[PDB]
UniProtKB/Swiss-Prot annotation:
This is Telomere repeat-binding protein 1. Residues 1-59 form the HTH myb-type domain. Disruption phenotype: No visible phenotype, probably due to redundancy. Homodimer and heterodimer with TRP2 and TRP3. Interacts with KU70. The gene is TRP1. It is found in: Nucleus.
Length: 97
């Protein structure tokens, strides 16, 4: 059958992103169960690349319907998002947003 046990994947992670984008901390749980892909943790930027693209590929529309100039927005939003979580300190050091 060659069937591989895969209940979740990057696709599901998408929704998980919309959920953690508020009470995030460091996509630790995301990278762990992203898709059994980075469950071993490769690199901070490596995972950052797969994550930043995971969202940019969603509906960010980096083409602007014009062309392909310089997709910097995806970088500014990815670093802002993560930095926000940590710099947010959970707002109350609790998951109770």
């Amino acid at each position: 059958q060659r069937r591989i046990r895969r209940p979740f994947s990057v696709a599901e992670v998408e929704a998980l992103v919309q959920a953690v984008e508020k009470l995030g901390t460091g996509r630790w749980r995301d990278v762990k169960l992203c898709a059994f892909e980075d469950a071993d943790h490769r690199t901070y930027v490596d995972l950052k690349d797969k994550w930043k693209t995971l969202v940019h590929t969603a509906k960010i529309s980096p083409q602007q319907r014009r062309g392909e100039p310089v997709p910097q927005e995806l970088l500014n939003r990815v670093l802002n998002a993560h930095g926000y979580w940590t710099q947010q300190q959970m707002q109350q050091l609790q998951q109770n947003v």
